[PDB]
Design an enzyme around this catalytic site. Structure first.
Site, PDB file in Angstrom:
ATOM      1  N   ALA C 247       0.821  -1.207   0.000  1.00 49.90           N
ATOM      2  CA  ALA C 247       0.000   0.000   0.000  1.00 49.90           C
ATOM      3  C   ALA C 247       0.858   1.260   0.000  1.00 49.90           C
ATOM      4  CB  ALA C 247      -0.944  -0.007   1.201  1.00 49.90           C
ATOM      5  N   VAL C 296      -2.011   5.813  -5.252  1.00 54.25           N
ATOM      6  CA  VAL C 296      -2.388   5.567  -3.864  1.00 54.25           C
ATOM      7  C   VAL C 296      -3.692   6.301  -3.587  1.00 54.25           C
ATOM      8  CG1 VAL C 296      -1.773   5.881  -1.444  1.00 54.25           C
ATOM      9  CG2 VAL C 296      -0.010   5.214  -3.085  1.00 54.25           C
ATOM     10  N   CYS C 302     -10.460   0.858  -2.873  1.00 50.71           N
ATOM     11  CA  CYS C 302      -9.603   1.468  -1.866  1.00 50.71           C
ATOM     12  C   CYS C 302     -10.388   2.503  -1.071  1.00 50.71           C
ATOM     13  CB  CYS C 302      -8.384   2.117  -2.524  1.00 50.71           C
ATOM     14  SG  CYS C 302      -7.225   2.882  -1.375  1.00 50.71           S
TER      15      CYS C 302
END
Ligand SMILES: Nc1ncnc2c1ncn2[C@@H]1O[C@H](COP(=O)(O)OP(=O)(O)OP(=O)(O)O)[C@@H](O)[C@H]1O
Ligand SMILES: Nc1ncnc2c1ncn2[C@@H]1O[C@H](COP(=O)(O)OP(=O)(O)OP(=O)(O)O)[C@@H](O)[C@H]1O
Ligand SMILES: Nc1ncnc2c1ncn2[C@@H]1O[C@H](COP(=O)(O)OP(=O)(O)OP(=O)(O)O)[C@@H](O)[C@H]1O
Ligand SMILES: Nc1nc2c(ncn2[C@@H]2O[C@H](COP(=O)(O)O)[C@@H](O)[C@H]2O)c(=O)[nH]1
Ligand SMILES: Nc1nc2c(ncn2[C@@H]2O[C@H](COP(=O)(O)O)[C@@H](O)[C@H]2O)c(=O)[nH]1
Ligand SMILES: Nc1nc2c(ncn2[C@@H]2O[C@H](COP(=O)(O)O)[C@@H](O)[C@H]2O)c(=O)[nH]1
Lengths: 474, 474, 474, 82
Positions: C247, C296, C302
């Site tokens: 991550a 990210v 996510c």
């Protein structure tokens, strides 16, 4: 019961299948009709409240007894609770009603939750037994819900001494902003409250009282265990009438229970049920029962018809059992299936002496259940059946017996959005019965049974006319 | 069958048109009633599972046979599959049930899809024949659906030797976090599983077994082809009862098939259908049939009424055919139209000795169909008819014959969201039948038929009472 | 990257905030564009499948590798499963696709459930390795769902020897009722199937193969445990490319893992991520990584942005990291946030050499998930995140660590009701990229990056034009 | 708390009733309660008792109200207004 010429159907009839034909009448006003019963129950109106835990509370008992009805306490209620309820009911006043009492240290949310236990619309704030203010729904709005009721109570209200003529209280409340008159004892403590409609009903209705002049109340007992000892305890507790209730009254166990209860010579009227046949009524009357409760299946919480196929339409069962009881000198109560005042009128015209109402009265303020709101925020309550409390009865055997036990059904009963109270339902029922008596031409219930003429209608006949407003039907 | 005085309608009656009148009863408890049948089928409960491909699986066969019922394998099933199913059914245990077996290398998604094949709520992980853990629905939630079940199986579970008294297993499971007891063989392999309700039912129900003490099973055969050879093959395969099924049983081909099957002297009870008339019942019985299957039209997957107008309400056909068969010493089965336990009770009171249930049992875990979810994610399954498998029968001729062939209807049967299993439906049906027997006053089914009193009701009569919960009705 | 004059916003940009300005072009046809990548991955199209358990199956691996892409196997997959998947992928044919194989003893329901594992629309019935018939969705309709597929399979189908020119197969299928050509081995066994669109794609697309001429496949590894041993095992298993995924790639543990993997000198391209800054890209490249994975937050599964606030719009991160990697001679992959072909086109124009697509490919037949249907019966599948498999890591400590662990998100990805297959999505993506190249005027991806001109648009600018059909967007 | 977690690992109800030495009810502890007791640190005062704060408005005698709140045992004072 006299039917129209040629009206001999090949099936049993419900309340929806029959109608009353008007006859020649001399009774013009509804107030000329006498609604007192002759079955020895002592009620001045033909309304009886069912022995169900969802309806038969102490508030309901007081409210119904003040207006001439009677409430049967549910079976298996502990004897201490029975004694407390009987004492509370018999300590009430015949005219003035019991209000909701609040402490000045209570919160606004608690006051708004307790405001719906009665139908007065206001609660009295009590400090050392003396009224100091009133709290209404309008005062609770727009304030912090955890604020004290001391900051929202209004200190100006109509006050009159207890024992004042209801017409004087009505005249005093004619110009009051709040339609609640606080009646006080001579020393100054809170005796109760009286509204305008309360005064009207006190002038219209006659309370059902015992020999000592106190409100009547009944109790129910099952056929399991020692029926004689339980009946003796209930009679000593102060019950004015005993009901022996079971799902299938036409069986040997019920006959044995009736014989055991009658052998004690308690001196109270005895009610037994339920049966839907003339043979069962004859057997129950011969066993020692004075009144026979009639109905198996039409209960709103009853699933016997769908589970077993056992049942009978209520009108035919009522007429048959009433004919049998009259031939034996007894009386019958019609239990279950009442949704409209026309159902009560047809049950009385069918030969019954009293009508027992269950789930319909669950949708009132006086019922012990909690008030709830649906999607549209319309008020409603929850009605449920007695289930195994009406049936004959280690953790292994408990589970084995409960695997086949009848489940507890559940329905939503909507309150009348404009009234909500049970006295309004009583008003509707009594008005319907009085209008039926005026249409038939009878001055009382026996003359209603003797003079009525009935006819059979199809499904299209039942759809004639205008339906009742919301809240007037179960 | 005795009807009420004056209840002589000018039309045929369905299950919704009739009701049972209570009588004087000495049977107080439901457990005092004997539900065994006397038609020679060997069932201890009056429930028979229809020979439909959507219901008659091996899991359903085992589950129903353990509780006293019987399952008829659908016709045209290959003889090898028949032999495998019979061997599997007759290799089962009379008390301990067969669990869902998982390998430790299986995925979580496969385990969650196999968890719904039984009603135990958990599956056993098996390594070289030995149980090593349990997998439940809670463990599968919140994890990767392609993870191995080794990572989610719990290694602590209640274990007891096979043959242990069910009450001991119940006591052991009283304090277990998972209500599944893994019963093992003396060597240590997996014998099966037993739940608390499983122990209760093993103490309540009696398994339907043959002379060798193994679970009973039946098979169905059509009237096309060589009926005698197929019947002989099915009898040699281990079938305990033979059903000759066709859409129109009152025809020469069915009589010829019955004679051909009876001439072989197989020694098994013979069931034939379907007819809805007394003359057809007499002809079928004279042809050699011991039991006559009754019903043409009321099948939930049947479109005969809408396509042809041919049919008959089930109650009148059942009473007429039962009277005819009793006059000839035979027995009748009531096939089709069963949605509520009251339907089974009325069919038994109508004179039938067994009730065959089809699509209602399709909405269970044990049915061979796949579990699906609707908009509201409520579980349901799909029921469909046998169509041309119940009818008399190059690519040109196949298309020509199929142009007029009956199509396969399809309906959605919702599972009970709280139970889902077929044993719960059996519990509901048996409780309803026992309560009917107690209301009538009969200790067994023959006394139920001899003592019952029936009445006719209108559409308003059927609406009395409270409906059943979701999943309790077809 | 060159922006329009004055287009210097004070915020970071997503894919929706930017557009491409057309320039002078000499490339007229889309087929004149070369879509091969130069990052050493070996893909002939810039599409890479994410290392997610919901997308990265063996069927998806084969299908994507045949069309020029590559699939990264998810991390923590057991080495035996990795070896089996690699062997299956590398044993496939470069032109002919693997069909769904059915046994003649399978049921119709099993065939209908297995028909949706591929996009051919039909399955081959195989007996002892030889094709004997085809089964389609139309044949399964209108029959008993438990009938054998032997009774519904059609015995007439187009057959051609393996190795036949795709245009000949197309000409043969031009007049076939079923658009499936069964290609067989010289001995007569089943080699596979080829459709018309399959032949077209074999003439359009170039397979991504290794030095031995077998389909390429990649594998992913985490930074927990012994990264070197796992990387060595994956390299020995036959993986053509290694991805070190976490991550937060800009941390000391990731640098240590990269150094440990690079010290083994395995000779495979090394991919590391994820970072969204130039400093992180420089650190990863200096640590030994050849390709840097960028993104990210924008992942569809996510929840980092909503839980922590940590993230960055994907376009700005991609341009910054691509500039840094180009200044260091490396390459970047754009991971996450791809819903439309314009996202892939903008990522390629932003400087990325490959685009990694996750949940968008979950809504296809080739994905390992099961096909489901919503209210409107529209096909869909379920996508879910890897959660703790991308993070750094008695029953007490397990619960303590899991109390703060990231949960598994879940979304519904709808399949294209007209196509459903992943090759159609690849066609849409490649057509969009080729059209972008023709609009810019570039013959290949490096020229696309060097010649592109970009501009910034407001929210109203993104709403211009016509939306894509259903199924063309994630 | 880890012993309570181990005891509740196999309990049908995930509630452990903790009692005083005399036998009266001291309270309850769950599995997640034990995990949080092992993860979180209680906010306590100098005497080791849980902290609590109080708020006061700017109307009236703010000093007297603040003094009364401090005497009541408040560990922190908030003067709040719009
Ligand atoms: N000891 C008891 N055991 C079982 N049921 C009881 C007991 N006491 C009361 N009930 C039932 O609870 C319901 C509520 O009765 P009641 O209104 O007298 O209760 P309460 O809560 O004291 O009254 P209120 O609503 O005025 O506060 C009734 O159905 C009554 O039968
Ligand atoms: N060979 C066959 N030909 C046709 N129908 C069959 C055949 N075998 C089984 N069936 C039918 O398929 C259905 C499923 O039966 P059964 O439950 O025995 O199958 P299964 O898949 O082996 O079992 P399980 O559901 O426990 O895995 C039944 O309706 C049965 O009649
Ligand atoms: N041993 C294993 N442990 C964990 N995950 C696994 C294992 N084997 C496979 N998986 C995962 O299960 C999913 C399905 O893998 P599989 O190879 O079956 O793909 P598929 O294309 O669906 O193939 P199939 O034809 O078997 O359906 C993938 O996400 C894969 O990573
Ligand atoms: N069989 C059955 N009858 C019930 C149950 N609850 C109430 N009853 C019956 O139904 C009557 C009330 O009728 P209602 O006015 O609710 O239609 C009760 O007096 C009682 O006779 C129950 O759970 N089962
Ligand atoms: N005509 C016809 N009857 C069917 C069909 N499928 C089942 N049946 C009949 O309906 C019965 C099942 O009734 P159910 O319980 O489904 O209402 C079966 O036992 C059989 O007699 C079909 O496709 N057509
Ligand atoms: N933080 C986080 N990222 C995830 C998760 N699952 C997938 N991703 C990231 O999102 C990418 C896929 O992006 P998508 O195409 O689904 O928008 C993956 O390649 C991976 O980088 C998850 O559970 N958590």
């Amino acid at each position: 019961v006299r039917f129209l010429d040629g009206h001999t159907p090949a099936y049993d009839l419900t309340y929806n299948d029959v109608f009353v034909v008007p006859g020649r009448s001399d009774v013009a006003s509804r107030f000329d009709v006498d609604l007192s019963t002759v079955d020895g129950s002592g009620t001045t109106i033909p309304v009886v409240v069912a022995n169900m835990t969802a309806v038969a509370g102490r508030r309901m008992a007081e409210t119904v007894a003040r207006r001439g009805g009677i409430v049967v306490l549910p079976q298996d209620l502990p004897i201490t609770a029975v004694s407390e309820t009987v004492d509370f009911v018999k300590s009430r006043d015949l005219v003035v009603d019991t209000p909701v009492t609040l402490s000045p240290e209570d919160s606004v949310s608690d006051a708004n939750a307790l405001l719906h236990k009665r139908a007065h619309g206001a609660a009295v704030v009590v400090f050392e037994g003396r009224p100091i203010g009133l709290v209404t729904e309008a005062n609770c709005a727009g304030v912090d819900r955890f604020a004290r009721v001391r900051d929202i109570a209004l200190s100006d209200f109509v006050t009159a001494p207890v024992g004042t003529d209801p017409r004087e209280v009505f005249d005093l409340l004619e110009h009051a902003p709040i339609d609640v008159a606080v009646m006080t004892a001579p020393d100054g403590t809170l005796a109760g409250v009286l509204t305008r409609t309360g005064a009207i009903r006190a002038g219209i209705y006659t309370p059902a009282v015992d020999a000592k002049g106190r409100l009547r109340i009944a109790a129910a007992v099952g056929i399991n265990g020692d029926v004689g000892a339980k009946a003796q305890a209930l009679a000593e507790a102060g019950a004015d009438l005993l009901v022996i209730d079971t799902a299938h009254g036409h069986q040997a166990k019920m006959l044995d229970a009736i014989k055991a209860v009658a052998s004690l010579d308690l001196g109270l009227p005895l009610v037994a049920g339920n049966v839907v046949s003339a043979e069962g009524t004859r057997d129950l009357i011969e066993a020692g029962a004075s009144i026979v409760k009639v109905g198996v299946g039409p209960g709103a919480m009853c699933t016997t018809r769908m589970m077993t196929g056992v049942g009978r339409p209520q009108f035919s069962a009522v007429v048959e059992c009433a004919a049998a009881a009259r031939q034996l000198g007894g009386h019958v109560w019609a239990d279950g299936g009442v949704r409209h005042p026309r159902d009560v009128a047809l049950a009385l015209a069918a030969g019954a002496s009293n009508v027992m109402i269950g789930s319909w009265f669950a949708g009132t303020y006086e019922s012990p259940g909690d008030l709830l709101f649906d999607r549209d925020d319309r008020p409603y309550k929850e009605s449920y059946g007695m289930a195994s409390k009406r049936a004959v009865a280690s953790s292994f055997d408990r589970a084995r017996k409960g695997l086949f036990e009848e489940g507890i059904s559940t329905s939503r009963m909507s309150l009348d959005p404009a009234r909500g109270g049970v006295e309004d339902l009583l008003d509707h029922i009594t008005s319907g019965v009085r209008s039926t008596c005026t249409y038939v031409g009878a001055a009382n219930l026996p003359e209603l049974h003797e003079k009525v003429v009935l006819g059979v209608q199809s499904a299209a006949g039942f759809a004639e006319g205008h339906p009742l407003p919301a809240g007037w039907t179960a």
